[PDB]
Design a protein around this ligand. Structure first.
Ligand code: NAG
Lengths: 163, 109, 50, 227, 50, 54, 99, 212, 50
């Protein structure tokens, strides 16, 4: 009375004989950082997502010591997920998200990229969305888009009392 | 070199109890923390006047055909106003109060 | 037919190669010109007598 | 430990499917990172790209061959199945399954050869040397020193081992090993050798030749040039 | 190599002033004394449209 | 399991279709997942093809 | 615009491919350009597929109408078409205006 | 797809001295290059990752330098385990293409070619063909050209070469060029000659085949 | 199983005939019942201790 599947994600198949690569699916890689990208366990009661969120295959290693792991389904919520929803609606492309594995955005280390940028440069993931800072060093190897929220090296102050 | 903080919450607590006079860090995350902070004791300053004023964005594979569509969609979303609606939905609408008058303490020397 | 007059009309006509000015990036312009990455983020406010 | 082993037939007819596979040990195919890929080495040539898969279950292919390549992984046995149908005769070279850590540089295994051609149980001359002996003549052996070597030709019978009088002709003035298989166009093969041996090595009541024990019919066949 | 640039009068982003008497540009310095950089700027007679 | 909530049902007049459509509708009624039966159709390509294509 | 359709109608096997794209026209609002001889058989194909049903709208030039006096009884009611002022602007009026 | 043209295939250095080898590709933003060393009869192995990170178990003197397009490998002192080929790949584009490489061998130039001609035998004469072999033996440099004269006319098309590997004992080559002739020309013209064009030989040793 | 309790739970079973009680009109209930025309209009509010 239980279902098992050989492949956790559904592979896409060539329909008949048509020379058209399925360009409308793009493995998008994200990074866990609230509130832009936040992680929720699948609702154990109904085994689904609430509609404002999106499915995402988070790869959890089996144990802190064991290197083995599974791409367990997980439910992705936030602001970047919503803007990705609107972007997918307007551009009309499907997608199969999966979270990062190295845990960081990515910084140059011995001429090697890591993290989100590392997984995007090697063309293992076409588009990358989340809380990513536009930077000069990153613009060299990766192509960015028009920013939607500003940022910088800002300062904050404790709110002083009235006088 | 002497004023480093171990973590974000460490410096946040220090500012809450006044261990440090000010905090220097990423603009958006500090805006977000000042949003949901208890009592609105933190203030972000500049109205965008920040050094190395850059933006968050979406990365793409180099020279991908998606650049034009992605950019056009993002600009359309910014122009019509749903961008700031999503902002208010998920960003720091909390606090955002007008500090009219805190109790005038004992008029000191 | 509706088209561009003055500034964007001048630039799209090829009489100039670039625009360096306080030009506001938006979807309608981004379709037919190309904007470099921004050099100053800013917004729209209101000016009134003091 | 990290062991790579391959599995595949050494020969196949063209326009068929090859289902070679490789198993990787020392880690898992789902070990949070390092995966398995495949690389092709044409004989006496550079290399061309085939495919790879990482632990996160992402597969990438070669755009030139996005018609017939298929690949799958089995983490339970820590192995990779391959499926390559509609093969072509130009595939007569080796293959390499490789450990494919996330960097652009994978770590390679021993490698396995595949030979696809018109070679069968009745192939013409591709496999293992055939015999040719002296015919008579009285025109060339009159002035200089003499030399007696074997003529090799027209050789299908892979059921024959190759050896040349071990510990007698390794360095005894012979370029016996220098001569290799002369790859022709329409499967024609015939070769020779030479020994710059002194005169006394011919007439000392011991005429040397080439001797091979053919276990297809189990005979000690001899071989000696021509005139 | 010569790129045609067109802009619009917008303080403090684009300051426009008349030339000197000899057609050159008056040399002024900032409060710190650094040279106030200048460009020739062939502008239309915007004072009176018509 | 593959998150294909969107679906539509089509069937012919081969026997057993009443039971199949009834069971599918009843299962749609009870489950909490929220299936979206956009249109259920029982056509017959042997007869007029125009309506079938429509 | 949904899709521009270029039709090689007089091709024997072209029709075999034609139903592949003609069936793929979902928009009720279609504009047509052909001749009357072409119009008859293209309308027959559309009817065999079902492009003349409810919702669908046909825009055609005066060429497919040919001589509107001989009304093609096969063509569907509700088809809207353009023509010159034939029955109002009479031939004597035409010639006198030309003179 | 990225083309990638390597260093000239004619590069070799004597044992124990410096050498530099660089492969040239497209000048786009491409620094994720991988460097391999190849073993004859064995599996090729890594030398440097990312053009700067030498792999584990790599001894010091294979210094991988360069940037942009020019990515070079420099060897302080060539040794026995350094022998092999050198391959290089770039990972910038979607198709990942390898390099051609270059064989490395001791640079001791000795040129004393030895030419042996052997006429067709009676078995292939019975078959109907004539396979005549011209063998160049015991010459180090890779330059070896075979010109076959039939009635003082250069022959082409039916002369196939057997370019052999560089052995390690004496570093010499044995190339056998075999000619397949029909009985028609065998009865038309009788004498055929093999000439061995060598870059070091100003007077090559040409030879015909004896009667019968 | 999507089961019901309360007034509607006992009504769809047919135990009762008419619910006379402050029952709130909405979509989910109206699927398995029908509602008379509203006899008292109302909204939703909060209590706090004065
Ligand atoms: C501001 O006033 C509050 C009293 O409500 C006091 O607790 C706090 O310490 C004051 N701020 C500082 C920086 O002392």
């Amino acid at each position: 009375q239980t279902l098992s599947l050989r492949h956790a994600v559904w592979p896409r198949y060539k329909s008949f004989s048509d020379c058209e690569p399925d360009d409308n699916h793009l493995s998008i890689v994200t990074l866990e950082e609230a509130p832009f990208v936040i992680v929720e366990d699948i609702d154990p009661l109904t085994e689904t997502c609430v509609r404002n969120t999106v499915p995402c295959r988070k790869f959890v290693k089996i144990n802190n010591s064991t290197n083995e792991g599974m791409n367990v389904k997980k439910c992705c919520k936030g602001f970047c997920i919503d803007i990705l929803k609107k972007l997918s609606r307007t551009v009309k492309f499907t997608y199969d998200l999966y979270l990062v594995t190295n845990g960081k955005h990515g910084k140059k280390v011995n001429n090697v990229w890591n993290g989100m940028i590392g997984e995007v440069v090697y063309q293992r993931a076409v588009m990358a969305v989340g809380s990513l800072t536009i930077n000069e060093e990153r613009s060299e190897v990766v192509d960015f888009s028009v920013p939607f929220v500003e940022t910088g090296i800002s300062v904050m102050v404790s709110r002083s009392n009235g006088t | 070199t002497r004023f480093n903080q171990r973590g974000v919450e460490d410096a946040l607590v220090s500012l809450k109890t006044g261990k440090l006079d000010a905090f220097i860090y990423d603009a958006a995350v500090l805006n977000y923390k000042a949003g949901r902070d208890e009592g609105c004791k933190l203030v972000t300053i500049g109205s965008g006047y920040i050094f190395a004023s850059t933006g968050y964005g979406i990365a793409l594979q180099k020279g991908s055909p998606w650049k034009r569509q992605i950019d056009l969609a993002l600009l359309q979303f910014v122009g019509d106003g749903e961008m700031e609606e999503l902002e208010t939905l998920w960003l720091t609408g909390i606090c955002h109060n007008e500090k009219n008058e805190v109790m005038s303490s004992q008029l000191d020397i | 037919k509706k088209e561009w007059n003055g500034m964007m009309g001048e630039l799209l006509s090829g009489q100039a190669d670039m625009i360096v000015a306080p030009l506001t990036i938006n979807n309608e312009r981004a379709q037919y010109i190309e904007f470099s990455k921004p050099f100053k983020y800013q917004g729209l406010t209101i000016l009134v007598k003091k | 430990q990290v062991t790579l082993k391959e599995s595949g037939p050494g020969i196949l007819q063209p326009s068929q499917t090859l289902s070679l596979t490789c198993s990787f040990s020392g880690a898992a195919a789902a070990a949070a990172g390092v995966g398995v890929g495949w690389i092709r080495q044409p004989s006496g040539k550079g290399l061309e790209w085939l495919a790879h898969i990482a632990a996160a279950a992402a597969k990438r292919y070669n755009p030139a061959l996005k018609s017939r390549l298929t690949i799958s992984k089995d983490t339970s046995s820590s192995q990779v199945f391959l499926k390559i149908a509609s093969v072509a005769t130009a595939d007569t070279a080796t293959y390499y399954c490789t450990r494919a850590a996330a960097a652009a540089a994978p770590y390679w295994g021993q490698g396995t050869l595949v030979t696809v051609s018109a070679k069968r149980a009745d192939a013409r001359t591709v496999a293992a040397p055939s015999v040719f002996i002296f015919p008579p003549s009285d025109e060339q052996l009159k002035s200089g020193t003499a030399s007696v070597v074997c003529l090799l030709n027209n050789f299908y019978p892979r059921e024959a081992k190759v050896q040349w009088k071990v510990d007698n002709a390794l360095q005894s003035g012979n370029s016996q090993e220098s001569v290799t298989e002369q790859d022709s166009k329409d499967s024609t093969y015939s070769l020779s050798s030479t020994l710059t041996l002194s005169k006394a090595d011919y007439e000392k009541h011991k005429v040397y030749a080439c001797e091979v024990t053919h276990q297809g019919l189990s005979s000690p066949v001899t071989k000696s040039f021509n005139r | 190599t010569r790129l045609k640039i067109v802009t619009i009068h917008q303080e403090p982003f684009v300051y426009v002033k008349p030339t000197m008497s000899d057609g050159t540009c008056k040399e002024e310095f900032t409060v710190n004394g650094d040279p106030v950089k200048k460009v020739i700027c062939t502008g239309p007679n915007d004072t009176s449209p018509g | 399991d593959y998150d294909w909530h969107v679906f539509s049902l089509v069937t012919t007049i081969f026997p057993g279709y009443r039971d199949f459509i009834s069971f599918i509708k009843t299962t749609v009624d009870n489950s909490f997942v929220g299936w979206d039966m956009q249109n259920v159709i029982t056509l017959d390509t042997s007869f007029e093809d125009a309506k079938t294509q429509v | 615009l949904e899709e521009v359709l270029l039709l090689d109608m007089s091709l024997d096997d072209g029709d075999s491919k034609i139903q592949n794209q003609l069936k793929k026209l979902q928009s009720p609002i279609i504009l047509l350009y052909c001749t009357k001889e072409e119009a008859t058989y293209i309308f027959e194909v559309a009817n065999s597929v079902g492009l003349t049903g409810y919702g669908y709208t046909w825009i055609v030039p005066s060429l497919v109408a040919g001589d509107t006096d001989t009304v093609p009884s096969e063509f569907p009611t509700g088809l809207i078409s353009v023509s010159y002022d034939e029955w109002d602007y009479g031939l004597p009026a035409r010639v006198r205006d030309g003179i």
